[PDB]
């Protein structure tokens, strides 16, 4: 069988697809995705609410339980939890059978929130609930830092949110830039009560 | 025909959330819902008391309690719908006479059970922020709804 | 600052821009601030990308050398210099039509397509220089190698699409991981073997010296300085050759005693498949190391962060640490904030840094344990980092009892505790351990209503006086910069530290006196949980726990099911969650992956040898390479992870590829007349070398993952011995048994 | 204009791709999609009040 | 719209933290807002 | 129909430093005065008021 015997015969041929085919690869291999590993953790949507100073158990039962009914049933979802903290806030984890779209889910997701939004106490409807999809892959970990403690942890939280967070959050595929720290500026009015 | 079932829903619900604003109060209360019509019927599974030992309502709770989220999580399924009796409330039935009698409008009894039917947030001793060596955090519990 | 990327991302391009970002904005910052790239996982990738590069190279150069023993021809090295790197780089656009991703698994699978791209380009090569040999010119000779092996290369592309993409179809987390590795080896395979048929053959055409015409300007400068090298090389390689036909021969005799190793040997197989424990996804140093603190339950946050400043100290005073990135409040339950609980990531140096032996992320961490033991205000325990963010336990379970039947938290907790407490008796399963907790401490509030109002005071005012005082409710915005920050009111620090501080807050009645809530609530110390967590909209406790990585967890999530089936209480039932749980779900795609496999392998060969017994000699070889591969890893007492797997599945695909040659081989010798058994001794002669050639080739390239000690070594040898053995008794097997099944199979065909 | 004759000479090669084809369909088979009819009523959302 | 309120007043109490919740967005390449005198408030996010 | 003068540029002056408005449109002013020294551009108008 001579399905050779063409290019034998035609060696630029044969080495025009070769480079053909090289070409190709080397513009793919700087059009590919680059990661660790692929997606293997299944999607799921998060849901966040604050009720400050409300008992675990107030939170779980006034705040989370009615949010749990509307997304319960949800399309293509694996299970949920959600968990209340005494330090009052309230975290849902809808997770999506692999293969779904995060996209969907969260739109989904929102929805049924939505629907239960006016069964929440109004303070907790006040300080807001946000849903989003989780960006399960950590490309790496920046720290602001007071290497002098010139600063305290508020005020590096509130520079990485004013000036820094924004400009990272809009690289090219950063999905989600999140802080973890102490918490931003506010107008605190504390009372002497006698 | 061929339109995308779920982006329809998100278009009609964006929608239907910019006319919320324009609604009555009380059906803002008790919310709006804007769902994916899923007509394929695969099959209905009736809860019963063979006996009448016990009631529509009370099957209809069950139902919601146990038996519709297990349905629903099976693979394929898009949807359980339960068709009876109203779910659960706990309904005070006013005597207007009575009401009266004590010199009181059906609003100030509505009042009372806003009032007295609530849960609380009833804060935290000790969290932070704390000055001396405070050694303890301990949330409060206090009983609010009924 | 976390950065996530998004789904088919670039983490090098992510990570340079902000690098450059961060570099940028400092430029801004005031003096007293400044930025730390605290961890950076994407230079692992990296490291892969170099790992394939060089691995790449050095196949490369080992080859050439191989050829260049074998073939003594400076020139016919060049058809494997041009043909592997044009496969291998090729890959990568397939793998982008199919929106595949560079990531560590498709990069592991490209380093073992090498090997058969490599083996492609052998065989072509050897083939037309055989014919050349023969005294045939480079045209003629190209022709006629390449009508003798054309058929066979097309069909070996099918057998190896069929043993590998299936692979790809499986279900979960292993068919996810199988997916990468089989794709991206099926796209590399096809495209060598297109280059297998017009390139390869082309430039050999035209490459290849025949008979005469030599010396051109490298040919007689490699013959002058090797020559002697190139003469003894082929007499002890000549020497090899007849030795080996005659024992061809003499198993060739005794082919029912070679029958009978044969199932001795498979019962073998079987055995040390059972033998050496299963894996998943091996441990790797990621470069740092966890270190959870739990004080006693309801201590303050102030308590915490001086028992985790503390274990920071400790862990920057420890060798090996590069850092202490420390959370006073973060809870290992959920990342969310616990006032008793904390944790210290303590940030390793680079691998290749100053860690040495006793220097190891193993190391680092007992050394911290036993130094946190010595902290005697909080357990601490510093615990090693998970291989792939977001799966964890690696042969293990976690479930949830859930209260279904408003059992309440108390009795819930009740049932938990007695699950552990019937579980831990011996069903080979663990420490079993749960985070549950209800007896941290906390107050209730008691408000007599009927007294409240009967004082004139409201019960709303009562509760609003307990949120805004001791809860702190939030009240409006403000403006500052244009931004909005929120006014805050509460209680100030003195008057909320303190039980009865309670008791000294006054609301008002409606008469306008300030009652003090001393006279209408009672406040009384209680129990509680900090987190309630509600599983499938469920109050439910996890408990967590499985065997040791020899045991599977199929036999321990029925020992546990088993026990809550007789444990636990009325109306609290529980439910898997997590990998465990997904598989439940899985049907075991594998059950149908190979015997779809080696059904369509079958098939495939059918079509090649127009025989329906043929196909045999080829399948009835790979159980060997398994055997050989599998006390390889048992001779190291190491896993049988998905790497080693997908190790396993390229070496049943060369032993394969070198028994499909030599049976075609043989089939063709046949029909020139030959008797079995002079048709598979001459073509298990005809292929000896080229099969060497690969064998050898593997082997050199085996020798530096071997002699690498003070380095990154332990994956590197701990695959390194797997492939001497895999590859030893991958040709072992193939040239001792393959003639034999060809001449069993071909003497039970017909009569 | 006619390729039926490189089958006639390699019967087992014409039963492969047959039996290839009967394996794919039996795959298919324990894949579809099963109901009464297809996806004929037009998509609709509902509101509730 | 908020009637009355001044451009000012509706810039900083109506556009900052509709923008601040907006700000991130997927794939958005910039927002404007713009608050006219007659208390109109207008949002523009474009994406990519 | 959404191109605006594409044979041009548009740009933002941004007030992140919490300057006035009044300060902002000194700012604005001194760089159009200042882009009108240097010879590459062309007139440069705004609409901030
Ligand atoms: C012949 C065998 C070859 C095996 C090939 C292995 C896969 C190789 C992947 C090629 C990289 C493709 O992805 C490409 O990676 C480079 C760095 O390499 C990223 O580059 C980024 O990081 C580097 C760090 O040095 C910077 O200098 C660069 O300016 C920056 O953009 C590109 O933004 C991205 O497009
Ligand atoms: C994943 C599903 C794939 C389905 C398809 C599988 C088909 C597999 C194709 C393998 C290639 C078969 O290709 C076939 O090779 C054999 C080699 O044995 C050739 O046949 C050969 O043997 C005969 C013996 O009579 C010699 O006389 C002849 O000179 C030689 O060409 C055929 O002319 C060629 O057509
Ligand atoms: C180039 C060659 C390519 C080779 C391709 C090989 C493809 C092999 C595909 C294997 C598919 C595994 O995928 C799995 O298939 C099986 C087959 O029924 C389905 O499994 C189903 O089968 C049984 C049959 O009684 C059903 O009753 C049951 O509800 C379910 O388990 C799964 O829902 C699907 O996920």
Do not use: C
């Not at chain 3, 595949?100 to 220089?129: K, R, T, W």
Request: net charge neutral; no cysteine.
């Amino acid at each position: 069988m001579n399905i050779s015997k063409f290019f034998i015969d035609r060696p630029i041929f044969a080495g025009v697809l070769s480079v053909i085919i090289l070409l190709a690869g080397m513009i793919a291999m700087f059009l590919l995705p680059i990661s660790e590993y692929p997606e293997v953790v299944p999607p799921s949507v998060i849901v966040k609410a604050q009720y400050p100073g409300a008992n675990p158990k107030v939170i779980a039962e006034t705040v989370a339980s009615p949010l749990e009914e509307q997304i319960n049933g949800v399309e293509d979802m694996l299970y949920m939890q959600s968990q209340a903290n005494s330090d009052g806030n309230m975290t849902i984890t809808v997770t999506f059978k692999l293969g779904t779209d995060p996209d969907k889910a969260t739109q989904l997701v929102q929805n049924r929130v939505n629907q239960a939004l006016p069964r929440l106490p109004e303070d907790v409807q006040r300080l807001g609930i946000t849903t989003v999809k989780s960006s399960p892959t950590l490309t790496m970990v920046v720290h602001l830092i007071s290497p002098n403690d010139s600063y305290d942890m508020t005020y590096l939280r509130n520079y990485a949110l004013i000036n820094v967070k924004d400009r990272l959050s809009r690289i090219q595929g950063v999905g989600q830039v999140q802080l973890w720290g102490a918490g931003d500026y506010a107008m605190r009015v504390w009372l002497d009560p006698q | 025909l061929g339109t995308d079932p779920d982006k329809a829903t998100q278009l009609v619900q964006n929608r239907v959330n910019q006319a919320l604003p324009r609604l009555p109060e009380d059906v803002q209360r008790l919310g709006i819902t804007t769902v994916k019509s899923s007509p394929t019927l695969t099959m209905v599974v009736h809860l019963i008391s063979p006996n009448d030992s016990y009631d529509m309502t009370y099957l209809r709770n069950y139902a919601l309690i146990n038996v519709k989220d297990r349905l629903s999580r099976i693979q394929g399924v898009g949807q359980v719908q339960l068709w009876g009796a109203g779910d659960y409330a706990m309904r005070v039935w006013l005597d207007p006479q009575k009401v009266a009698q004590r010199n009181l409008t059906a609003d100030d009894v509505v009042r009372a059970i806003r009032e007295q039917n609530v849960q609380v947030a009833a804060g935290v001793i000790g969290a932070s922020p704390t000055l001396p060596g405070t050694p303890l955090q301990l949330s409060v519990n206090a009983r609010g709804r009924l | 600052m976390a950065i996530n990327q998004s789904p088919g991302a670039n983490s090098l391009a992510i990570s340079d821009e902000v690098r450059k970002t961060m570099a940028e904005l400092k430029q801004d910052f005031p003096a007293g601030v400044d930025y730390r790239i605290v961890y950076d996982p994407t230079q692992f990738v990296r490291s892969s990308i170099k790992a394939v590069v060089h691995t790449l190279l050095e196949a490369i150069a080992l080859v050439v050398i191989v050829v260049i023993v074998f073939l003594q021809t400076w020139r016919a090295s060049i058809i494997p210099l041009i043909a592997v790197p044009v496969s291998i780089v090729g890959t990568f656009s397939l793998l982008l039509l199919f929106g595949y991703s560079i990531n560590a698994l498709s990069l592991f699978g490209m380093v073992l397509a090498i090997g058969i791209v490599v083996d492609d380009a052998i065989v072509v090569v050897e083939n037309v220089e055989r014919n050349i040999e023969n005294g045939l010119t480079a045209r003629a000779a190209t022709y006629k190698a390449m009508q003798e092996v054309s058929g066979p290369i097309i069909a070996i592309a099918l057998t190896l699409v069929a043993v590998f993409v299936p692979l790809a179809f499986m279900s979960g987390l292993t068919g996810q991981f199988y997916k990468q590795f089989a794709m991206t080896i099926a796209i590399s395979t096809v495209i060598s073997a297109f280059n297998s048929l017009t390139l390869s053959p082309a430039l050999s055409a035209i490459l290849l010296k025949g008979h005469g015409d030599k010396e051109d300007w490298l040919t007689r400068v490699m013959n002058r300085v090797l020559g002697g090298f190139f003469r003894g090389f082929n007499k002890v390689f000549h020497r090899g050759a007849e030795n080996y036909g005659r024992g061809v021969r003499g198993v060739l005799s005794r082919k029912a005693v070679m029958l009978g190793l044969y199932l001795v040997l498979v019962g073998a197989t079987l055995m040390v498949s059972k033998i050496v424990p299963g894996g998943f996804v091996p441990a790797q140093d990621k470069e740092y190391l966890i270190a959870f603190a739990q004080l006693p339950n309801g201590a303050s946050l102030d308590r915490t962060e001086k028992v985790i400043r503390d274990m920071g100290a400790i862990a920057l005073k420890q060798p090996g640490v590069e850092s202490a990135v420390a959370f006073p409040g973060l809870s290992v339950n959920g990342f969310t904030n616990s006032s008793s609980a904390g944790i210290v990531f303590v940030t390793l140096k680079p691998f290749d840094q100053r860690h040495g032996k006793a220097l190891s992320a193993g190391a680092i961490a007992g050394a911290l344990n036993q130094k946190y033991a010595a902290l005697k205000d909080s357990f601490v325990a510093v615990f090693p980092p998970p291989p792939v963010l977001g799966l964890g336990t690696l042969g293990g379970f976690k479930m949830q009892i859930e209260d279904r039947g408003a059992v309440g938290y108390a009795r819930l907790a009740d049932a938990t505790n007695d699950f552990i407490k019937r579980a831990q008796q011996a069903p080979e399963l663990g420490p079993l351990f749960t985070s549950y907790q209800i007896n941290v401490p906390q107050l209730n509030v008691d408000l007599d209503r009927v007294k409240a109002k009967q004082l004139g005071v409201n019960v709303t005012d009562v509760f609003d006086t307990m949120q805004i005082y001791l809860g702190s409710l939030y009240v409006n915005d403000f403006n500052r910069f244009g931004r909005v920050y929120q006014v805050r009111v509460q209680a100030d620090a003195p008057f909320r530290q303190r039980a009865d501080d309670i008791l000294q807050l006054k609301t008002r009645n409606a008469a306008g006196e300030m009652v003090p809530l001393s006279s209408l609530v009672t406040v009384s110390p209680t129990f509680g949980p900090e987190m309630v967590v509600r599983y499938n909209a469920y109050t439910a406790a996890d408990v967590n726990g499985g065997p040791a990585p020899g045991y599977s967890s199929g036999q321990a999530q029925a020992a546990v099911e088993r026990i809550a089936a007789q444990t636990l209480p009325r109306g609290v039932k529980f439910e898997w969650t997590d990998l465990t749980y997904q598989q439940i779900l899985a049907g075991d795609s594998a059950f149908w992956v190979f015997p779809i496999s080696v059904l369509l392998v079958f098939l495939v060969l059918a079509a090649l040898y127009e025989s329906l017994t043929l196909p045999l000699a080829v399948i009835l070889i790979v159980p060997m390479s398994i055997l050989s591969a599998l006390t390889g890893v048992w001779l190291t007492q190491g896993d049988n992870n998905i790497f080693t797997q997908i190790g396993l599945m390229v070496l049943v695909g060369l032993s394969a590829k070198n028994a499909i040659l030599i049976v075609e081989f043989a089939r063709e010798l046949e029909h020139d007349g030959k008797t079995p058994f002079e048709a598979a001794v001459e073509a298990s002669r005809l292929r000896l070398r080229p099969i060497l050639m690969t064998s050898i080739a593997f082997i050199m390239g085996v020798v530096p993952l071997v002699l690498s000690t003070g380095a990154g070594a332990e994956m590197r040898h701990a695959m390194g011995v797997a492939v001497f053995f895999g590859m030893l008794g991958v040709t072992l097997f193939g040239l001792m048994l393959t003639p034999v099944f060809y001449v069993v199979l071909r003497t039970l065909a017909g009569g």
